[PDB]
Design a protein around this ligand. Structure first.
Ligand SMILES: Nc1ncnc2c1ncn2[C@@H]1O[C@H](COP(=O)(O)OP(=O)(O)OP(=O)(O)O)[C@@H](O)[C@H]1O
Ligand SMILES: Nc1ncnc2c1ncn2[C@@H]1O[C@H](COP(=O)(O)OP(=O)(O)OP(=O)(O)O)[C@@H](O)[C@H]1O
Ligand SMILES: Nc1ncnc2c1ncn2[C@@H]1O[C@H](COP(=O)(O)OP(=O)(O)OP(=O)(O)O)[C@@H](O)[C@H]1O
Ligand SMILES: Nc1ncnc2c1ncn2[C@@H]1O[C@H](COP(=O)(O)OP(=O)(O)OP(=O)(O)O)[C@@H](O)[C@H]1O
Lengths: 217, 216, 216, 217
């Protein structure tokens, strides 16, 4: 099918190899630290001690055999940039790299990393949103303006109805799901009961939702 | 009202930086001087302090904060001691970064209010996108049901939504279409889907992957 | 023209020291305090600064400089970041020292204007002089044609310019003779060549070595 | 076959051992760092891990077999001085050493190094010349006063003739070569066309050339 190589068994890298392997893919786990390789031995199709900045060592892995190579070295900029440069030079189709900061992202961009990820910064802003707005449990941005948000229902909604407390007429948003005591009602039909601490999944404009949050909850 | 970010990591530093951009009251704490100096501009306040020493934590007036975030994820000893102090000092909400399953366990037992694994979580999400080249982004509603954002293949170019019904056929529902940046929230059949458009589907996790196989 | 030398190495420090002796405007930058103090006297100006931090580079007023030289050749991370900053800050001429082929490649891609390998270059030149004990110094005009300075053997002692011709015999041309320090430029046949006198020949690289074999 | 020994596989040393070997000489690559030796294994007649300051280790290499020994240790003064002292004591005919600074040069001079080189300082002044004078591409000094200089032709010379814009009479210098679009004209005969960005090779007095640079270009 398709073959994966995870260079850098960080908390990020190690989670990718561990997941991809649980999904039952072909994953090569690479790390310069022996102890890290030994640890992920059981959680990878394969584990190998190698310094990803040395070319001959990368060829020994048969890196050219991989469709996707992930460089999850995010603390060492020098290790990361050199490795990704090697990978691009060795004509790897998809190179996904972890970046440290804006500048590291810039170097990776210029040496042709195919997709760059800031796992910490991204999770940072998402957690910050949940801190600031105690109502938002989780969310996904469709664009800069429009977003799907999962909200914890306050007592301000306990035993309330949809045909009653409408959103798309009143706020221009649409409710997609309700989760009461673990049970899930997708594409719910008005009227439905919403209890307190229910997961309410709303969808629309980012500003529109926060207006509903203010006045509805 | 008031936020305290202890540990200006890449994770911690992003929280302070964001909360401050949102215009909240954020206290940036770090034992490393250079880190404090860096986040000075991106915080309501910056202070050099060793969060494991009690008197130093009191000097910050930590008891003044509604939410304290311990984004120390490499040092288990630093993290556990700090969080223990915070719980002992009766902070209402303590959010901590964990390193691994075991560190999570120690934090759980000393009463951290919410524990986060930013790397492991982002790990599984990125792995999903690696394995399934179609899934751009997603959010899990539960273990079984999920909302998924999909990149449309040539297998969908100039297809009508009602023509290629996801609902009747697969038990899923299409929520949005993004063509050339323009967004059609809650789209009405029929609508044109071009190649490389963002298709937002919703339903059962297994059901979606069945649509991915046969539809795309 | 205003010059900025970031990295007071043996290489960087020599550029600063020379440009300053020539009486230009040179800003000497280094993260190591002791290095800055040392080159204080040998620069228009010396400043302790970490060239990878942007605000620190702006504090120098780096955007003031026509030519900035990054003579950091041991630290690849320092070098690449600095040069990236310099390109981002729209510096017209960025001259960087490289460590190896790969470092050269990263610098190339982030838009360094001229890349130099002072050690590798001087390596091959010294190697030539080792292998061929006759060649004192040289300059390549191309890959094939070169001007070479040769130490005259006893095989040439008291030989005449026309007598031992190269303009007809080998297709090369003699440009200068240096006997006991005295210099005869574009010499007219016949001229006396003593032993150990610097002979400056010019032509094809292969042609010269043929003259070296048969003439000397 | 003349025999070469390169002690210290720096960027400088490693370049000598890589070049001499490409020329197909006999070169012994020595370094105390294992990883360095392993790297230059392919690019040397031989590679050996050895501490050049220990005598017995130097004898084990059979150093007395070598006509030319190059000590390209330029960061460690103690390593360099001791090594060179050993080499002189062991009666090596030609000892070429890399120096760090004026003082290191002095120590080497007194312990009988046969030729001392400052690769960085030398390349420093040459590059500085090219920075200051944007016209000079490359040069070679015949003495302190007289020099052969390679110059990039400005628009101030585009489609100009040789005998038209004479140097042999006007400035006391002589043009030796012209390089237009890669093609090379050695000992050019007046008149010849000089286009813009054409490599012009002039020869004469250092002051004389810069006078031509000012008024001609
Ligand atoms: N040259 C290399 N080749 C392969 N792996 C390397 C190399 N250098 C470092 N690593 C490994 O890559 C992994 C990436 O960790 P990195 O410590 O440098 O920090 P990190 O990306 O911030 O970690 P985390 O994912 O937990 O946030 C480590 O296990 C490290 O040993
Ligand atoms: N005793 C302490 N008190 C307060 N802050 C500390 C203390 N010890 C360490 N820190 C800081 O807290 C932060 C925690 O970072 P830690 O490097 O050690 O890894 P990390 O949290 O996983 O990094 P990252 O967030 O980038 O993934 C760092 O800025 C560190 O300097
Ligand atoms: N971020 C920085 N900002 C300014 N100067 C720096 C920075 N980082 C390193 N330097 C300085 O630049 C130089 C780094 O180059 P490196 O000395 O280690 O030597 P080199 O370029 O490989 O060769 P050489 O010493 O012969 O010039 C050092 O002098 C160091 O003090
Ligand atoms: N005592 C020794 N015995 C054997 N090898 C040594 C000894 N000392 C240094 N070396 C090696 O010789 C080399 C000399 O490099 P040196 O770092 O010390 O600085 P350098 O001459 O400025 O480097 P560069 O050639 O890049 O300019 C290194 O590879 C080093 O490992």
């Amino acid at each position: 099918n398709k073959q994966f190589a995870v260079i850098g068994l960080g908390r990020f890298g190690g989670s990718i190899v561990k997941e991809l392997h649980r999904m039952g893919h072909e994953v090569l786990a690479v790390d310069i630290n022996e102890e890290k390789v030994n640890a992920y031995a059981s959680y990878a199709t394969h584990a190998v001690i190698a310094n990803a900045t040395e070319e001959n060592e990368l060829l020994s892995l048969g890196i050219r055999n991989f469709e996707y190579v992930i460089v999850a070295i995010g603390a060492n900029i020098q290790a990361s940039t050199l490795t990704t440069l090697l990978l691009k030079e060795l004509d790897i189709p998809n190179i996904w790299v972890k970046a440290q900061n804006y500048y590291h992202h810039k170097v990776l961009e210029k040496i042709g990393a195919d997709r760059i990820i800031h796992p910490e910064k991204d999770m940072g802003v998402k957690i910050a949103q949940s801190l600031s707005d105690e109502n938002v449990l989780n969310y996904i941005d469709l664009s800069d303006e429009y977003s799907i948000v999962e909200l914890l229902a306050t007592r301000k909604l306990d035993s309330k109805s949809i045909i009653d407390l409408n959103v798309r007429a009143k706020y221009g948003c649409t409710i997609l799901a309700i989760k009461h005591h673990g049970d899930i009602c997708l594409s719910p039909a008005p009227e439905d009961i919403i209890r307190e601490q229910d997961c309410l999944v709303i969808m629309g404009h980012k500003k529109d939702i926060k207006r509903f949050e203010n006045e509805g909850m």
